[PDB]
Scaffold this active site. Structure first.
Site, PDB file in Angstrom:
ATOM      1  N   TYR B  46     -10.773 -10.542  13.382  1.00  0.00           N
ATOM      2  CA  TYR B  46      -9.510 -10.988  12.811  1.00  0.00           C
ATOM      3  C   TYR B  46      -9.893 -11.994  11.739  1.00  0.00           C
ATOM      4  O   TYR B  46     -10.438 -13.053  12.048  1.00  0.00           O
ATOM      5  CB  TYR B  46      -8.648 -11.671  13.874  1.00  0.00           C
ATOM      6  N   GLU B  48      -7.714 -13.424   9.189  1.00  0.00           N
ATOM      7  CA  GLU B  48      -6.558 -13.907   8.448  1.00  0.00           C
ATOM      8  C   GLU B  48      -6.994 -15.036   7.529  1.00  0.00           C
ATOM      9  O   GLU B  48      -7.793 -15.897   7.911  1.00  0.00           O
ATOM     10  CB  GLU B  48      -5.462 -14.391   9.397  1.00  0.00           C
ATOM     11  N   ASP B 192       0.652  -0.441 -12.700  1.00  0.00           N
ATOM     12  CA  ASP B 192       0.258   0.192 -11.453  1.00  0.00           C
ATOM     13  C   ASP B 192      -0.657   1.331 -11.888  1.00  0.00           C
ATOM     14  O   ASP B 192      -0.186   2.392 -12.304  1.00  0.00           O
ATOM     15  CB  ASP B 192       1.485   0.742 -10.737  1.00  0.00           C
ATOM     16  N   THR B 218      -4.362   1.662  -5.893  1.00  0.00           N
ATOM     17  CA  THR B 218      -4.800   2.155  -4.603  1.00  0.00           C
ATOM     18  C   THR B 218      -6.312   2.215  -4.804  1.00  0.00           C
ATOM     19  O   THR B 218      -6.788   2.203  -5.947  1.00  0.00           O
ATOM     20  CB  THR B 218      -4.296   3.586  -4.323  1.00  0.00           C
ATOM     21  N   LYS B 221      -7.573   7.956  -4.470  1.00  0.00           N
ATOM     22  CA  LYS B 221      -7.102   8.694  -5.651  1.00  0.00           C
ATOM     23  C   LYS B 221      -8.291   8.850  -6.611  1.00  0.00           C
ATOM     24  O   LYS B 221      -9.383   9.155  -6.140  1.00  0.00           O
ATOM     25  CB  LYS B 221      -5.876   8.029  -6.303  1.00  0.00           C
ATOM     26  N   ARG B 227      -8.716   4.681   1.856  1.00  0.00           N
ATOM     27  CA  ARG B 227      -7.276   4.566   1.686  1.00  0.00           C
ATOM     28  C   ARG B 227      -6.866   3.102   1.851  1.00  0.00           C
ATOM     29  O   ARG B 227      -7.060   2.507   2.913  1.00  0.00           O
ATOM     30  CB  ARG B 227      -6.580   5.467   2.706  1.00  0.00           C
TER      31      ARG B 227
HETATM   32  C1  LIG Z   1      -0.229   6.225  -4.693  1.00  0.00           C
HETATM   33  C2  LIG Z   1       0.626   5.202  -5.417  1.00  0.00           C
HETATM   34  C3  LIG Z   1       1.235   4.095  -4.787  1.00  0.00           C
HETATM   35  C4  LIG Z   1       1.245   3.814  -3.280  1.00  0.00           C
HETATM   36  O1  LIG Z   1       0.109   3.859  -2.501  1.00  0.00           O
HETATM   37  P1  LIG Z   1       0.129   4.194  -0.945  1.00  0.00           P
HETATM   38  O2  LIG Z   1      -1.371   3.879  -0.568  1.00  0.00           O
HETATM   39  O3  LIG Z   1       0.434   5.634  -0.737  1.00  0.00           O
HETATM   40  O4  LIG Z   1       1.051   3.261  -0.242  1.00  0.00           O
HETATM   41  C5  LIG Z   1       1.930   3.214  -5.549  1.00  0.00           C
HETATM   42  N1  LIG Z   1       2.032   3.388  -6.894  1.00  0.00           N
HETATM   43  C6  LIG Z   1       1.455   4.441  -7.519  1.00  0.00           C
HETATM   44  C7  LIG Z   1       1.608   4.598  -9.039  1.00  0.00           C
HETATM   45  C8  LIG Z   1       0.751   5.353  -6.790  1.00  0.00           C
HETATM   46  O5  LIG Z   1       0.181   6.446  -7.439  1.00  0.00           O
HETATM   47  C1  LIG Z   2      -1.125  -9.921  16.045  1.00  0.00           C
HETATM   48  C2  LIG Z   2       0.398  -9.958  15.978  1.00  0.00           C
HETATM   49  C3  LIG Z   2       1.162  -9.475  14.890  1.00  0.00           C
HETATM   50  C4  LIG Z   2       0.596  -8.924  13.562  1.00  0.00           C
HETATM   51  O1  LIG Z   2      -0.338  -7.908  13.439  1.00  0.00           O
HETATM   52  P1  LIG Z   2      -1.257  -7.717  12.156  1.00  0.00           P
HETATM   53  O2  LIG Z   2      -1.931  -6.339  12.495  1.00  0.00           O
HETATM   54  O3  LIG Z   2      -2.275  -8.795  12.103  1.00  0.00           O
HETATM   55  O4  LIG Z   2      -0.424  -7.591  10.938  1.00  0.00           O
HETATM   56  C5  LIG Z   2       2.518  -9.531  14.972  1.00  0.00           C
HETATM   57  N1  LIG Z   2       3.127 -10.039  16.078  1.00  0.00           N
HETATM   58  C6  LIG Z   2       2.418 -10.506  17.132  1.00  0.00           C
HETATM   59  C7  LIG Z   2       3.163 -11.080  18.357  1.00  0.00           C
HETATM   60  C8  LIG Z   2       1.054 -10.469  17.092  1.00  0.00           C
HETATM   61  O5  LIG Z   2       0.332 -10.965  18.170  1.00  0.00           O
END
Ligand SMILES: *Cc1c(COP(=O)(O)O)cnc(C)c1O
Ligand SMILES: *Cc1c(COP(=O)(O)O)cnc(C)c1O
Lengths: 402, 402
Positions: B46, B48, B192, B218, B221, B227
């Site tokens: 973790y 953060e 973007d 991203t 692509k 991803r």
């Molecule tokens: C693919 C794409 C996204 C979003 O990405 P995800 O990983 O699918 O959430 C946003 N903007 C553009 C222009 C994209 O081609």
């Molecule tokens: C760990 C946790 C989250 C958030 O998860 P992330 O994968 O770090 O975004 C949300 N709520 C509770 C109660 C958590 O313990």
């Protein structure tokens, strides 16, 4: 050409994980097969939408994988609907809030200082930025939630959503009571079971499914799955709305390789062996807390009902920051945590939070907790030393990772 | 116990990927080492916060991994700052919008029907739900963006943010002009580059870094990475603001195993071989578009400057949905896509989008596009048939996989 600079770092991280004691309550160690699934070619597939209703061709196999994850999640938690696409616990909560509220609405959740999570209303988080927030904490005299106060706050502030669950609360939740309060004020009850999801799956923690309108969770933590999110409910109609908030609402392409990993994690949790693991997690937490209490520390609420506990360091005149540093120096990782109505500021605190999921996965058992407590106490009393760091290193190595 | 059922499905997906022609413009095939990093033990930590500024200890190695990804992203794109924590392209955009606007502000992006992505203003997406959206499109005669038209729209609506870039626009962007337009109304220009990020990295597409205030993308692509998402900027101070929106703003713990994969992908993109790959991607797209045009298919804008192109099937008497299904039936995967001033609804559309990144990664060359064009044409004209399916399978299997 292999990216040798990057892989040298991964080897170092593997070594680090092998040679220390991870006591951060939200951590765990995933199995080799969970990693195999996450590192699969499923990452190559764009699969926006849901099984049988995708926005791209070629999802025939991905649909079987996602459906498998969904069906297993429903069987594991006794749910009627599930969404396995959230990228994280934060996204699971975000989608649910946006499905149940509009910006400006009032959200009620546990105060961060009392053990609540950032997504339960923090002003620096989307939860506090998009919604008005009313928080509840713990009583100064009990160190536990006060249902009477939760009710009073709900009646006065009339929240649209009330969140039960937290990241640093060592006792069981009265979900039935929270639902009664929610119903009295016409609010939705959302239970964020991220921390104790594995315990719920093992039948060692009250099940929120029947009482909450919606349940959110991470797939990692006590559930010991890949890093990601999950949403469950006994209301398929509400589920349909939440599905729309995950996509096209807040996400794009789901991480199908991670979803495959979620399926594997659910498979593991459905095995009888997972209940034994979970029993040891809770027994280890209870025992370690008791052993530290016997050595001169105080445990917030007097103990724990789950996988984590909070150590009040005041009896030994230490701050949480100091304790965290001394332990880190000998290879033991914990995190500072404020005790109820802590006399020290948040950057200092008077306590630390410890959780047993990770060491339990590595084979630690209850009869070994006295030793762990002794090593922790020595680090805090004597301070760091090469001898202590090496004893910890040897102990860690004697408990192999998955 | 091994989850045999799940791994059998993964084997089936590997088989599907090996035996078909993946022509979805937003897909690609990651390398074995990118998969190795994503399937690493880094998921167990973790982290953060940010490098050198984490909530918890024990991130000493993780910090070097994330930092390596950040510095490589900066070097690859000529950026002064980078955030490698976004879980996806959608989260990258979400964080940027929340850092630059407040709910209710005006957001200007490309119309979905003209090529814009759903996160550029769709009413059912967070972009259209949180902000007041105005959209620009393309000319009906050339199907190209008219900068004068964009400028007029900006002056009329005075957007706080203007988004350049799209998910289905086949031509180059004039980022300098878009910045001039943004400056005329005091708006932030967000580019973007998700779709063409790899082309930018290879120097085969105009680079937005010097002109955009912020760039989102991203890592999958054309960049051919794991991803996930990415944010860049020529302004480190603005970057600091955006960092706060990614965390604690909209995400919790980052996926460090994926971040390791991003570092690996950036390493691969920095190799001279990536430029050769990218050159072939564009050559393949141009040649395939030409081959289809020679078979009577209408290509939107008449061709392409990048890795993708759109086919208007109205003249052929076929809907985008029907085409997607017919092709999928013989192992050729694409996705339906709206055409400029498309009369049919989004759920149907009048065309399909084709992209060459994936097949180029498998070794397809421009000289093979005449054969790919023939198979596509036959699938749409004659419909599915084991005979045609086998020819597709043979051509696919003649090319190895990463
Ligand atoms: C693919 C794409 C996204 C979003 O990405 P995800 O990983 O699918 O959430 C946003 N903007 C553009 C222009 C994209 O081609
Ligand atoms: C760990 C946790 C989250 C958030 O998860 P992330 O994968 O770090 O975004 C949300 N709520 C509770 C109660 C958590 O313990």
């Amino acid at each position: 050409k292999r990216d040798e600079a990057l892989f040298e770092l991964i080897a170092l991280e593997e070594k680090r994980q092998r040679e220390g004691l991870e006591l951060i309550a939200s951590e765990n160690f995933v199995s080799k097969q969970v990693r195999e699934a996450v590192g699969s070619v499923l990452t190559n597939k764009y699969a926006e939408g849901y099984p049988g209703a995708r926005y791209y061709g070629g999802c025939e196999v991905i649909d079987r994988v996602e459906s498998l994850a969904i069906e297993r999640a429903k069987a594991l938690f006794g749910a009627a609907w599930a969404n396995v696409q959230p990228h994280s616990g934060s996204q699971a909560n975000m989608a649910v809030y946006m499905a149940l509220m509009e910006p400006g609405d009032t959200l009620m959740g546990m105060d961060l200082a009392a053990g609540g999570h950032l997504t339960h209303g923090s002003r620096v988080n989307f939860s506090g930025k998009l919604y008005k927030v009313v928080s509840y904490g713990v009583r100064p005299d009990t160190e536990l939630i006060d249902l009477e106060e939760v009710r009073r706050l709900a009646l006065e502030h009339r929240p649209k959503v009330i969140v039960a669950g937290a990241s640093a609360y060592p006792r069981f939740w009265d979900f039935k009571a929270f639902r009664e309060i929610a119903d009295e004020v016409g609010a939705y009850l959302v239970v964020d079971m991220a921390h104790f999801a594995g315990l719920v799956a093992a039948g060692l923690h009250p099940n929120p499914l029947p009482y909450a309108h919606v349940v959110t969770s991470t797939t990692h933590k006590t559930l010991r799955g890949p890093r990601g999110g999950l949403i469950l409910s006994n209301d398929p109609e509400l589920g349909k709305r939440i599905d729309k908030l995950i996509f096209p609402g807040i996400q794009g392409g789901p991480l199908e390789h991670v979803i495959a990993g979620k399926a594997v994690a659910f498979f593991e949790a459905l095995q009888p062996e997972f209940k034994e693991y979970s029993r040891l997690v809770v027994e280890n937490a209870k025992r370690l807390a008791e052993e530290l209490a016997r050595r001169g520390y105080r445990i917030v609420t007097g103990g724990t009902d789950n996988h984590l506990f909070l150590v009040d360091l005041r009896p030994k005149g230490l701050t949480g920051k100091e304790a965290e540093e001394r332990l880190d120096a000998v290879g033991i990782t914990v995190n500072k945590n404020a005790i109820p109505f802590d006399p020290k500021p948040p950057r200092v605190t008077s306590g630390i939070r410890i959780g047993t999921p990770a060491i339990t996965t590595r084979g630690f058992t209850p009869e070994e907790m006295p030793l762990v407590a002794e090593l922790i106490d020595r680090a805090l009393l004597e301070g760091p030393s090469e001898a202590l760091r090496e004893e910890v290193r040897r102990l860690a190595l004697a408990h192999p990772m998955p």
